[PDB]
Amino acid sequence: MKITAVRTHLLHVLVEIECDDGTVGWGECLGPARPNAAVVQAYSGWLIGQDPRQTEKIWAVLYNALRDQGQRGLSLTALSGIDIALWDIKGKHYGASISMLLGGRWRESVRAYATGDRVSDNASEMAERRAEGFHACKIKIGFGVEEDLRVIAAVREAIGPDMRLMIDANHGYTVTEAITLGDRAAGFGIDWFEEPVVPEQLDAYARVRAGQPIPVAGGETWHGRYGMWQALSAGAVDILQPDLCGCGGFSEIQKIATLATLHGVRIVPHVWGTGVQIAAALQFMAAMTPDPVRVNPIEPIMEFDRTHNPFRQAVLREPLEAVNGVVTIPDGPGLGIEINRDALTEFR
Amino acid sequence: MKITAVRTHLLHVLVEIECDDGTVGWGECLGPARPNAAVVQAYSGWLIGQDPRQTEKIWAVLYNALRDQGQRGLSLTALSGIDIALWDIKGKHYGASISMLLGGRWRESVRAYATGDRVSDNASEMAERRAEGFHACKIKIGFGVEEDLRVIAAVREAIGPDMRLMIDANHGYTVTEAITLGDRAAGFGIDWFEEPVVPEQLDAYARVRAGQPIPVAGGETWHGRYGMWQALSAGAVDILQPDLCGCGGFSEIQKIATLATLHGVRIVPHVWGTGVQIAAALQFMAAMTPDPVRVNPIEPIMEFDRTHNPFRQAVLREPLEAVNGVVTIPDGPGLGIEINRDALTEFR
Amino acid sequence: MKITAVRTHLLHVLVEIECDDGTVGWGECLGPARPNAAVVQAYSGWLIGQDPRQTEKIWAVLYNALRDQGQRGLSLTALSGIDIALWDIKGKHYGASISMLLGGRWRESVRAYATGDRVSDNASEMAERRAEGFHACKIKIGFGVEEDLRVIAAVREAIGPDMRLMIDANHGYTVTEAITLGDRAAGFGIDWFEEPVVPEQLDAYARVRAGQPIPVAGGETWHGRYGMWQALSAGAVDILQPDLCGCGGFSEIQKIATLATLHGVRIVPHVWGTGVQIAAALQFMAAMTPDPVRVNPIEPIMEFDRTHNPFRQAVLREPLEAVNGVVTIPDGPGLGIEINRDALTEFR
Amino acid sequence: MKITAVRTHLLHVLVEIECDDGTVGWGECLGPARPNAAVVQAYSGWLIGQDPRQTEKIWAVLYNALRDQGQRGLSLTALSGIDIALWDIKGKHYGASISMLLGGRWRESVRAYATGDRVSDNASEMAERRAEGFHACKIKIGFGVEEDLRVIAAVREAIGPDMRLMIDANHGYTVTEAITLGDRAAGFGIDWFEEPVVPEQLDAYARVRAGQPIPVAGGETWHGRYGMWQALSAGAVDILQPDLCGCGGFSEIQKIATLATLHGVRIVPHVWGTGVQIAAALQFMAAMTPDPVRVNPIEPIMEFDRTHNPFRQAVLREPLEAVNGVVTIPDGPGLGIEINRDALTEFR
Amino acid sequence: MKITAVRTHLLHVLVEIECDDGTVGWGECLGPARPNAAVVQAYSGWLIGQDPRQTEKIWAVLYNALRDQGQRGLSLTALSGIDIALWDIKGKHYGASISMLLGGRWRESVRAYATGDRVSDNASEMAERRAEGFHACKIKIGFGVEEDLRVIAAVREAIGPDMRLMIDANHGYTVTEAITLGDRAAGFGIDWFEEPVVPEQLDAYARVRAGQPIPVAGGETWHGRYGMWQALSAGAVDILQPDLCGCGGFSEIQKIATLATLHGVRIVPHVWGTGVQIAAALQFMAAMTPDPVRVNPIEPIMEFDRTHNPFRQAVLREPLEAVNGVVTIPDGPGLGIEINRDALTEFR
Numbered sequence A, B, C, D, E: 001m002k003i004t005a006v007r008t009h010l011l012h013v014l015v016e017i018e019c020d021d022g023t024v025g026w027g028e029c030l031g032p033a034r035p036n037a038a039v040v041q042a043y044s045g046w047l048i049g050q051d052p053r054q055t056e057k058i059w060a061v062l063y064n065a066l067r068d069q070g071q072r073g074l075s076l077t078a079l080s081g082i083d084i085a086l087w088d089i090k091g092k093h094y095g096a097s098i099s100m101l102l103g104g105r106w107r108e109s110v111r112a113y114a115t116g117d118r119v120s121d122n123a124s125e126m127a128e129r130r131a132e133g134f135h136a137c138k139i140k141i142g143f144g145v146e147e148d149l150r151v152i153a154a155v156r157e158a159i160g161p162d163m164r165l166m167i168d169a170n171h172g173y174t175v176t177e178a179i180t181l182g183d184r185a186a187g188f189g190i191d192w193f194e195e196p197v198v199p200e201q202l203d204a205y206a207r208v209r210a211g212q213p214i215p216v217a218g219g220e221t222w223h224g225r226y227g228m229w230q231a232l233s234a235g236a237v238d239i240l241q242p243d244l245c246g247c248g249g250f251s252e253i254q255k256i257a258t259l260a261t262l263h264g265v266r267i268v269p270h271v272w273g274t275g276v277q278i279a280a281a282l283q284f285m286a287a288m289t290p291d292p293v294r295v296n297p298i299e300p301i302m303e304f305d306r307t308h309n310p311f312r313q314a315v316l317r318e319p320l321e322a323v324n325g326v327v328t329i330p331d332g333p334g335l336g337i338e339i340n341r342d343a344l345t346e347f348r
């Protein structure tokens, strides 16, 4: 078969790839819509007439094409959208869920965790999330050690002793702030400490890991296999969080997962974007191989953001929803979803 | 679909896996036939009733099952046979060549290299290989520096200045012998120096790489991703040579190829065994991504051994043959081959 | 003298080697019976007519023979059986206990430790072991941090404050689980933490050692001198646990013990298998040199599993038994034991 | 059995150990006679009544006894004499050559190399050695680069192009001298460069190895397993040369050989002393395992010094002699030799 | 001036060197008397007629003379005796205290620390030492963690909360024992932990330093500058304890002190032997440069052993005694002492 058209849509950029036999695949790119769309349009000059089944060859040709333009990250976010759409097309052509094409379904669902006067508001909100059935929540910090600790303390009190708690500083801290925060918050029972410092300073991450006891997580902006491998080599993280729509799509995240196993580093995919990104992430989560394999292994969990969730899921005919804290993974062909075109508006 | 039976055959052990819908896949295991067959028989207790499409899940479950038995290498060679058969089944089920399932066909053929009174015999034989059209040949050394040099010198003279020449010591040398050989043979124009020292001494490999200028190759017995990664980390090789039927099959060699790209280490698959192993290797070679991508990139080449070649290819209805030094890669469903069952004899 | 025959038996594979003068030696191989037997049968083609007294030469020739078959671990487990039988023959020929041939008897006995609604069952069982006289016990974990902690807590309560306690996760944990478990269990008084993570990830072991305070033990599946040395170099363990029937027999475990002394790493031999493996382990334990030598030094202790113990010891005429927690080490020629042939059934 | 007496003799100190059943063993210690004899006398206070068959236990007890006296090297040279005598006793008790007790005879003989107006004298002498049948010779340098080169050049001319040539500076050079010498002499065909710099500066050895291409050898004064391991870890040598009578006897040199295999470093035993030391070295050489095993492997060669050779061999009834460059290895019980007591004079 | 004679005496070997002008110097060697005396006698062959003022030239010539005898430690202990006597002669010739020749007197005295049913006996004895005025004491452990802890606890109770407490295991522990002991004893207030593990395993020392919080001390048997530098490079110790009579005398301990300053490692000289060794140590202590220089800096303290103290000091006319815990440092020419010859008996 052959690609006959590549289109870009908004409402976050979505990539639509149509084939001669009528098969349509959908993908999504991380980051600013316009830069991604321009690059996809550029990529499409070559994609037209190509065989969409050859995802590795397409990936490598397109990735290599944009090397001297300096914008590695943009190449990867743009390629991600194309790559996801292509796997969607493969799944539809072959009659298989992407999770099956990736090597099989370990799980039919994943547990979600909920993400959120800052002290009382977090405490209230997180208390409601627990009532809604979420086994875990993640709270945003990185503003100031003393205030952040007040928030963490109030959230632990509000959610009771059992619900899991993660914290995310979104690179808000200096190393010293992060180490001090981690030392003082550890007593509250924290499963991970996300992006404590700026993402370019991998040795600072390692410093935070060695200076306080909460497991450190990162990776949503560390590009593809090379960026991930640099962080793994520096000992930057206990948990790696690749973004499917940012790191190079299914083709590249498979390679990242391999690297993580060498280091015994857990993968927890970054989930954020429209229903398309979410659908792609869930296919990967279904297929993720436990490290180690055992009865009741450690399994991926899915970030769930009630903020703009209705909006972000409007692109889907059937929303991927958390039911008592659990999200079911589609098993139909490709991403197993149907696009609501009306919700979109075509760009260029 | 479901696996209904797993059978082992001889004539080198071959693995046959039959499914409920009648689909049959074929694979092959490196090493002693009987140990491999026993483990495959053991694996089959679980395989029966499983969905053959779920190759990653099957791989990881089976690999994990044999961990405390101490025999990691045997797990991998046995699993390899199963894994190859399963991909053959996937290809047949999906209507796709394995090379397409692996991500696309970069090439429809590969150049072969020919492998071989030891001085005159090598010189004559290699001179005939050149006349047969092979662009390259590999000669066996590791017996004694002075004698090996005489052989290398006579082969270069006999094949003219253009044909490429590789040498393989099959771990015959001490570090000092290997460094001395490499220093003195380099002037003859040698593309690589295969397995100069014992395969357990990765630092010795690195020593050979740093002490003489011919590129060092190895890997046919370094197990799966972990064994390969140890060699890559030690700086053991310029060229990695994974064996499909030994390292864990298509599932595991894909992961090995990823690792090699981090290090900018070339992959040249080990080719040796029956027509089944050869067919599997060729599917992988078709799909191998150049590192780097460029016009006329460096491409895999295929070891071709005229020794027992008719015998080893008797398992195929249509032999994979070198025509003026070039081997065409099948593009039919799965391995793209048909088994000559009459040539086999079932074991157990 | 000369080897006249090599036979394999079941009931776990046992190796019987007979000599021209009538001397018979017995050994045992770790892992699946059939693969081991096939390789022993293969080895026997050469062994027949060889001088059984030349154990190092035999070891190295046989080990080298199976290098390119990829199955290093299988070579070692098979060789182990042969090697143990050969030392048994040497001891009988020379009129000496293997422990004397290994360099002398430091000790005539060793203290055993006992190995075992999962919470109450462990607590009850371990409470009985203490009453039986065992100075120590080892409990199996690696299922889930919270549940495992409940088990550990109940076992410590049940056995009182004096009995030593070890834990074994059998590679059940991720690094993070293992570090968290170790941190929270340390307060219960734990002498070692066995195989916290998968055995291929040596750096993960080191991570567990640096992240929590219980001493880490491993080694039952790290092959021979090279595998052991990789783990020692990575800082993987505080305690190394080579399996005599798995690592290459007496010839190879002596070399492993040497390596451990360089690193000041304690050796505690893995004990598991039939009475033959147990007998071999005890000969090694008698001869193990303290590190350091002092009055009342740290001494090997022997794992004792009441599970299938009667069965596994049925191969012996006189069972090696724990009497108030202490096992006496035979001092007769060779392994100092007599085989109950009736309990066996010959294979091939 | 039991040791009844330990005696020290001169003519180089010799150690005689007599047992209750009349068995007598002989050993030798490296270095100044009197210090060695005093320590042996001290050791004998404990040795009397001990079982001579327990060589490892005896070794470790005696080695540990002298730790805080500061004189590690003296402990090892003294222990060496005792250890050699004990193995001689074991061999006699058991009816076995030491080479058999060490694990078997790989070889019944070894090739010797010959050791030697300094320019003409070396040239003449080495020319005679070649006529006598020696395959190789070693010349003494370390006096001055220009003069040493003149010597090397004249020796190569005199011995023809085939005879192997080694050089020994006996720590005479600075690093710079050694690198310059090695660079300029390499063209003469030199198999190794012995002790280029002072033995305490292991990093200087490594510097010499990296700065010039002749293989570096050392080790005659690097104590036992720990001293050897430090040199191996520093990358000090291509060839390790332990002295049996200096490094801790057969018990300790076995451990050193193990360490060398990890590093793929060749062992060539230092041979120097009376006929007793030579006899011990030859037993070890018979038993040395090739690294790697192959047809016609690299084998130990024996230093042969015609200087005081008649004198040093006067302690033997039958001299170990080079016949056309080859020395046959005794195969009788123990060291396989008989002592000429008349040649000795008892000390203390 | 010229050396006319060198004599060795007992009552521990003492070295007497007489000069043509009648000047006599005295020194002492660590370790077994007889080996030291033999080497001193050997050294004397050359010393006679040499200028005793040239201590560095003499040191280096004599040290170099014994290199290939393997006995580095013995060279240093023997040389130490000579070197101390030579500095004594220099001081007498020049009219200066050795402490002045070493570069000046920072202090006229040092505080001593006292060294010692094992629980009650230590507690009683240490309680008396406190009453005698010692600011500190050191207790001997390394027998068994539980018993050693009982001792430490009872000693802290008996001596009150202010007196300083050090512990010395004399290499009695495995790494694990030492780490466990240090963790559990730290709460008692321990200034240092001496020789926790065997002195050959420098990495084990480092392991003990990183695994528990009491400062680690060692060095009494690490030879001269090279042995000390290896320990410093390995991060073996917080406190280095060179023995003047063992490490190469004043000439070599000055060099060791220099090395320690690079690493910011404290020097506390080992004090043990006759009054001569004590006198030499005190001269060095007077001259030791603080690291850092400040008002009331950290100063050397002197081990004081009431065991055989009268005996060991019998060699002096005026004993160096602790008065309320403080020892005054002689300021007369040389070692500032007078020998009681009657207490000696000449050897050889």
Ligand SMILES: [Ca+2]
Residues within 6 Å of the ligand: A128, A132
């Ligand atoms: Ca709500």
Ligand SMILES: [Ca+2]
Residues within 6 Å of the ligand: A168, A170, A194, A195, A220
């Ligand atoms: Ca985030």
Ligand SMILES: [Ca+2]
Residues within 6 Å of the ligand: A179, A183, A211, A212, A213
């Ligand atoms: Ca901290």
Ligand SMILES: [Ca+2]
Residues within 6 Å of the ligand: B128, B132
């Ligand atoms: Ca032909």
Ligand SMILES: [Ca+2]
Residues within 6 Å of the ligand: B168, B170, B194, B195, B220
């Ligand atoms: Ca090969």
Ligand SMILES: [Ca+2]
Residues within 6 Å of the ligand: B179, B183, B211, B212, B213, D213
């Ligand atoms: Ca070179």
Ligand SMILES: [Ca+2]
Residues within 6 Å of the ligand: C128, C132
């Ligand atoms: Ca019971």
Ligand SMILES: [Ca+2]
Residues within 6 Å of the ligand: C168, C170, C194, C195, C220
């Ligand atoms: Ca275990």
Ligand SMILES: [Ca+2]
Residues within 6 Å of the ligand: A213, C179, C183, C211, C212, C213
């Ligand atoms: Ca921790």
Ligand SMILES: [Ca+2]
Residues within 6 Å of the ligand: D128, D132
């Ligand atoms: Ca002659």
Ligand SMILES: [Ca+2]
Residues within 6 Å of the ligand: D168, D170, D194, D195, D220
């Ligand atoms: Ca030499």
Ligand SMILES: [Ca+2]
Residues within 6 Å of the ligand: D179, D183, D211, D212, D213
């Ligand atoms: Ca150079």
Ligand SMILES: [Ca+2]
Residues within 6 Å of the ligand: E128, E132
């Ligand atoms: Ca008193």
Ligand SMILES: [Ca+2]
Residues within 6 Å of the ligand: E168, E170, E194, E195, E220
């Ligand atoms: Ca001490």
Ligand SMILES: [Ca+2]
Residues within 6 Å of the ligand: C213, E179, E183, E211, E212, E213
């Ligand atoms: Ca600690």
Ligand SMILES: [Cl-]
Residues within 6 Å of the ligand: A024, A025, A339
């Ligand atoms: Cl659509």
